[PDB]
Amino acid sequence: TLRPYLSAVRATLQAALCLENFSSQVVERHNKPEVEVRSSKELLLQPVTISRNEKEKVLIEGSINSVRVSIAVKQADEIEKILCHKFMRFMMMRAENFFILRRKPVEGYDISFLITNFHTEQMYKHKLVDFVIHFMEEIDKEISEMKLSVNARARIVAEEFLKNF
Amino acid sequence: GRLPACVVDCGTGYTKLGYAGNTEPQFIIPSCIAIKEVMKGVDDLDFFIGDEAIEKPTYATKWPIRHGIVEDWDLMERFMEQVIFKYLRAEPEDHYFLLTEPPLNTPENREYTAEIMFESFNVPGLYIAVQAVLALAASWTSRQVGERTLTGTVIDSGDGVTHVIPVAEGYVIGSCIKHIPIAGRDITYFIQQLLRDREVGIPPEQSLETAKAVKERYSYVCPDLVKEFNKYDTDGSKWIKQYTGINAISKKEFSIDVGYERFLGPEIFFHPEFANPDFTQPISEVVDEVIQNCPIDVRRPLYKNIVLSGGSTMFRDFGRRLQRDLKRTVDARLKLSEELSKPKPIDVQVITHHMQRYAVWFGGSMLASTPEFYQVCHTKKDYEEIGPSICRHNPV
Amino acid sequence: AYHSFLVEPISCHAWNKDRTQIAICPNNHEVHIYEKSGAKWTKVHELKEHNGQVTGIDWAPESNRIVTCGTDRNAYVWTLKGRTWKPTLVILRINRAARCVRWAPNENKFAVGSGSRVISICYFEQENDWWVCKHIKKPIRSTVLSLDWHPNNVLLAAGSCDFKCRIFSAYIKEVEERPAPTPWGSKMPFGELMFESSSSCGWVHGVCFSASGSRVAWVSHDSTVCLADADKKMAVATLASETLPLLALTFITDNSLVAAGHDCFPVLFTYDAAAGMLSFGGRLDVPAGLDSLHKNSVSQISVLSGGKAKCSQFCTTGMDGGMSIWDVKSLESALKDLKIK
Amino acid sequence: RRVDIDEFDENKAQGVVLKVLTNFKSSEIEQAVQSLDRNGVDLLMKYIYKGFEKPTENSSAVLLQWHEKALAVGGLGSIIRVLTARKTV
Amino acid sequence: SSLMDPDTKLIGNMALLPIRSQFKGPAPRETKDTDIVDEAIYYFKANVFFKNYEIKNEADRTLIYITLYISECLKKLQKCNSKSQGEKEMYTLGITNFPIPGEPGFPLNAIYAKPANKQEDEVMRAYLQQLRQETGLRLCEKVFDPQNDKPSKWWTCFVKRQFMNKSLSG
Amino acid sequence: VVCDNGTGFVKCGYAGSNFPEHIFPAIDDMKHLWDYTFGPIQAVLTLYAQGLLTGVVVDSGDGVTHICPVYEGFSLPHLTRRLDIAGRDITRYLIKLLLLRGYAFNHSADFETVRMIKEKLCYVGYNIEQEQKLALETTVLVESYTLPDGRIIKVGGERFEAPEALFQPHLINVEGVGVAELLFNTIQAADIDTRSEFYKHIVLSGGSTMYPGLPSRLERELKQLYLERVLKGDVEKLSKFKIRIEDPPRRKHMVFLGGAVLADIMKDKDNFWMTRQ
Amino acid sequence: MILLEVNNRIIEETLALKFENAAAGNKPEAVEVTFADFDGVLYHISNPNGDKTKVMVSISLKFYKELQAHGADELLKRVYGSFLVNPESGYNVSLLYDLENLPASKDSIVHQAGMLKRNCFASVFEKYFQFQEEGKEGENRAVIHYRDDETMYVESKKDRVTVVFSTVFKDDDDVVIGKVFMQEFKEGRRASHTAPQVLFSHREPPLELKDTDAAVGDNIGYITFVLFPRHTNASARDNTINLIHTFRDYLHYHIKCSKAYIHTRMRAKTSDFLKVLNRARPDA
Ligand SMILES: Nc1ncnc2c1ncn2[C@@H]1O[C@H](COP(=O)(O)OP(=O)(O)OP(=O)(O)O)[C@@H](O)[C@H]1O
Ligand SMILES: Nc1ncnc2c1ncn2[C@@H]1O[C@H](COP(=O)(O)OP(=O)(O)OP(=O)(O)O)[C@@H](O)[C@H]1O
């Protein structure tokens, strides 16, 4: 059931993202996203969650012009935890050129997607949904290969040293 | 504070390694890497830098340190691996490193470099200074100065693109730098073609190294060309020499003449029109144009100290003629002044010393053997507490 | 039929009275008037005055005027002086971005809705040569989103973010004389609240009166659409959408409606007044990587052909430079599930 | 710089649903979801966003199948009525 | 200045330069034994690698004419195997004519003042004959070694080096 | 006819116009200004431009900042104070921000290029901590720019920090105020008669008011200070309190413009000036 | 590389230059090169007291108090001999080469100036290879601190020798990766059954040395080496001590290398997502 889990997410992100331009109700002449500053209560939508198990959960927090989507990542053991934590902290250094994310995730969550109105304009917003799915598609497998990378390359390193005695 | 600190100084063509306190580096290795034609384990360790990289015909020789910037990180990263555990043998958790970088690098490219040292090498310190400042820090020991000053002019003479920088209070000025595509490499091509046309019997497939050493062992700045050709014709003795090339293929010795490519070799800095019609502008005033862009207050300090850098200023009295070449420049522009107009004439001095072969690295042993360097390093906890924005900038 | 202009999102579209020229701003300081030259489009005018973005425009079809509203709290009236259009300084006594604007059919006053929970109404005085702003403050509590006029030049619809479609009374008494009575109520002064909607669900994105102005309808953010009557005494009827979020909607007779949204293909509507039923039609259409010709959502619907009553041609402009022009009689043929009353 | 005055201005049952759905098997979703009216789906729509917010041992697995049949019936606008309800249950 | 004085006058694109020649007598005449074409060989190798020589004078019009003349002569003494074989190929090129000012087929016509009459062009041909005469016998002792039939390699290394990238004949 | 000769920017023009019809600065040294000029208080002019009598002026331009209480006809001179924070010192602070971001700039040569960035990218924040949850947390503030030598830098968290650190007496080395503080000091130094008159009669004038949201911070900080020192903690008595702060659209070209409404011109003006009486 | 350099490439380039100056008869030069290596080892090569023909190697440590009581001076005074002189001020051992007394084939002492830290760890091993091969048990175990927190524990047994590193994994991420290297080190005899077998535990010292003050901590694992006489016989002392005296530094290598392998794999992948994000961005 790994496939239909992404489907309902794909079935929710499309519903999530139908936005517009909207200036600040609070401040003169500004345009700041609503799901971050949270100063106008009535605009913020109801935060929803979709999960497959105790762990694989995705939060969506909608507003009038921005949606903060966050993702829990499957962390099977401690050796993948540093594989989880670096792979995040690699890309979170690089959210300036790769620039639709947050720098620091939600407390309890692993990475936070922040799509404004402008990012729905200069990009095809029926495919930014598909990119968010694509990011969850292969980091299941991306970390899965690097475990098999390390458990192979130690075996190359060790067998050389021990036969040399 | 008892075991000293590495100063890895990755130049354009030649990497300059070495530990602190040292007059000269323990390596002068060509900045190049051989890599196999992704690769895993034993496939992903076969890394060979420098001298074996030029040697090995099996693997290709990438030069990722190109124009001073990094072409690609994942091959730069392997070069920073085996610059430590194979040639420096330093303790990777116990030295406050000092990487170095050419001017106008983006402050993304700092946090690409500083990331890997704090996340694949666990270094206890790091301080990525610019090449220009620690260049002129080397000339503080010179007898041409008596007082310390960190404001003046450096003349980088690199291998990909030479630069010119005015510097002020320990900070480069990103407005006034100028690419000039003369280099160390441009002198190689045409004097190789100058011995294609006069010497007979040199195999073409190694003639660049052949052209290299005669530039190394026999070049000199000629002071003035029009008297110079007669001094070969009047005197065939004390100007004509003979170079003894070793045939790397056919295993022999071949003698070649040391003739006219001596004096024109360094002279193309004084006129670029000898080898390129892309620049009609000599070096005698293009540094003065870079001078004439900075504000009015900083120019009068900027005349007193022009500093030579890089290996491509290892030619006999290169500073002497170019001193006169700037005195012809600046006095003619104030010759406009007194006519129309009163301001005092200003002295201009260039700087030379012994280690100007590699005076970029020699600044690294004036810093890492001082306690103030231990004050200003990024510690490892500073990356872990606050994030890469502390290491995206540089301290003083 | 589909022309496309640009990559930028255009704010809103309007036409001349013959419905030939069009005027839009594609996400900039500059609203551009375009015009057919056969099947060829001509950038006939450019407007460079607003120091902020602009958000809503209406061409005055009869006085040849152009109203603006934007985000630098400034609204400018553009009237044709020969070839070069000239602005007009209009102070609304509000401080932030406006949202939408449209002329009353007398062309004597225009309604601006904005973020300071008030609606500024400028009607033109003649001695000072001035558009005096007068305000409808109570009980609007949120940012006003969409507006619509009754054809009597007296009433004024209002839709904001407090979910409550509060239809009003804004009879200006000094440039207009005492109008006829209205099936809402009797006394109509300025600022007179008349009826607050029963909608506590979904934002109020688009409102419109009918050609009578006795009927009024609105679509909501929660995929619903609701209509009420002045003749049937404020009776709000309820209908939920089973499609996608939606913005714009318009009448075509007095009880027949057409609305499109974030799919940019329509799906008609008719108000069954006999059974009291808002019943959603059926796309009435017939079928990058997209079935609809235009890429982004709708931003506006408006009728090319002779008012909202006739009612045949209508175009769809959205958050991209394309226009899909749609004729009703062009759509009458191939559809097998349409409903028209 | 130390106080919030953005608010002080002069303007502007649960455990029953999870118990039945997890006891309802996966094969009878089509007979359970489609038996409700236009308002019963949106009533069921807020139900599915309860156990997905508060998971248990056997909660989040089968309710994705419960989200599946209600997706096609509810369409795409049925989800908004979770988002936009400023007073909800 | 060094190649120009108001005592001599501008006839043609250049001023008629005071020669010292193979013969003595009535000619444009100078005091010192050093000639312009001596100087056109003396400061030759300091001028051979430029791209755009300055104009301080009209004697440069002569001076780069000799340069393109030597640019022809370097193509000839690539193939020479004795001093007599070199001179007869220089007597060959010293007689054979190429176009000279404002003339099609001759490059750089935009620089030179063109004499329009029939008179001054012929006198220029009578002077450019002397340019083709007086240069070649001074190239005998200066290209070849004092041990005869030994072409010096210090004139070989200009065979690809030109004033600019033009072909002289085509 | 009106003449307008300034300190850091000098104007000229005719009567009944829309703008200063030419602009050029003043290069003893003001006595030579008459040569290129004839060839083609401010606050009373500023108030009557908006068309009022007694109010509060936020005069924030280039060289120095004034705050002016001014009555119907005359000013309030002893009430009208003058600060010493300028507009340039914002830019001088803004370099050091971007320098610690990592971009090389000199304070002398690179001066005007940063001044372009300030007038395009930089603004003010209503609060600091919710604002600083955008630099450390989110992408949004990061916006591109292009240098005139062709380089493209990105500025994120150093946009909103134009005003803040030299309001503190450390970075300015001067014990002083914020911005609403000396504002609030002056009204409570003023009368009680026209006190609530003042809090709906605040005008902003100058190019150093072009920061968006600056009338959203002055409204927020005065709700501290009137709660602090005057009303001393009460809830609903603060809800009565009138706050209206004004800023004209054409205010940057208004000082010469507003005088045209007062300027009841004559047949003669030469007959009083002492070199031409 | 895959095996480290028991060679010392910071001298083997240096003095190999130096004798060829005298072999060409050139005048020697003022050389003073001061530099380091693994494990806190400091070097100093200089002309001693002002003559350019005299070339002095000089090494400082902190172990010579703990090491000299384990038979140090029998080894290197035998091997180096008249090369070895009085220790220089501030230095434990000080060798000396004079370039007026060059040997015949210089590629020996150039090579045998590169074992200069290797010859100090050998003598404590050579002392305790005697005690195994002659059965003389009842011996105190050598407790040798080779850093501030890095202690060496040897053990002579009946038919074997075991030896123990007291490693400290100073960061937090290295520990989790570092435990995976001892897995295949525990699985070393899947095809290499002639290999010296290794035990490992983390944070818990071995019970054989539980009587000591052996610490307990998150940074610390304990690594053994079962040494049969088949690898410590008289034929292969010198092979075995070359491998074993760098194994702490060897394991610092492939931890950092396997970190480096991630940042080349992952930097490729951040270009892949940034590719796909530019495709939904329009061609226009
Ligand atoms: N005595 C010499 N004679 C001739 N050429 C020399 C001499 N010394 C050095 N060079 C030349 O100088 C070049 C080295 O320049 P440089 O030291 O600037 O390289 P780099 O350190 O890699 O560059 P950079 O420091 O600018 O990044 C070499 O290519 C060499 O050919
Ligand atoms: N659009 C803008 N955004 C931000 N700052 C601006 C803008 N326009 C001008 N400024 C700032 O305003 C200052 C000048 O404004 P102003 O014209 O009010 O002062 P000034 O009249 O020149 O000074 P003085 O009164 O001394 O003549 C400049 O220093 C500039 O930094």
Residue numbers in the entry:
A (entry chain F): 4 to 168
B (entry chain A): 3 to 39, 51 to 354, 359 to 413
C (entry chain C): 2 to 288, 319 to 372
D (entry chain G): 12 to 23, 75 to 151
E (entry chain E): 6 to 175
F (entry chain B): 9 to 35, 83 to 95, 140 to 376
G (entry chain D): 1 to 284
In the authors' words:
When activated by a nucleation-promoting factor such as WAVE or WASP, the Arp2/3 complex is unique in its ability to assemble branched actin networks by stimulating new filament growth from the side of existing actin filaments.
To begin to understand how subunit composition affects the properties of human Arp2/3 complexes, we used recombinant protein expression and cryo-electron microscopy (cryo-EM) to determine the structure of the most active human Arp2/3 complex, containing ARPC1B and ARPC5L subunits, referred to here as Arp2/3-C1B-C5L. We first determined the 4.2 Å resolution structure and calculated a pseudo-atomic model of the most active human Arp2/3 complex Arp2/3-C1B-C5L. The complex shows the characteristic triangle shape – ∼150 Å×130 Å and ∼100 Å thick – seen in previous crystallographically determined structures of Arp2/3 complex purified from bovine brain and yeast. In contrast, while subdomains 3 and 4 of Arp2 are well ordered and at a similar resolution to the rest of the reconstruction, density corresponding to subdomain 1 is present but poorly defined and subdomain 2 is even less distinct. Density corresponding to the ARPC5L C-terminal helix-α7 is present and forms the major contact with the body of the Arp2/3 complex via ARPC4; at lower thresholds, density corresponding to helix-α5 and -α6 are also visible (right).
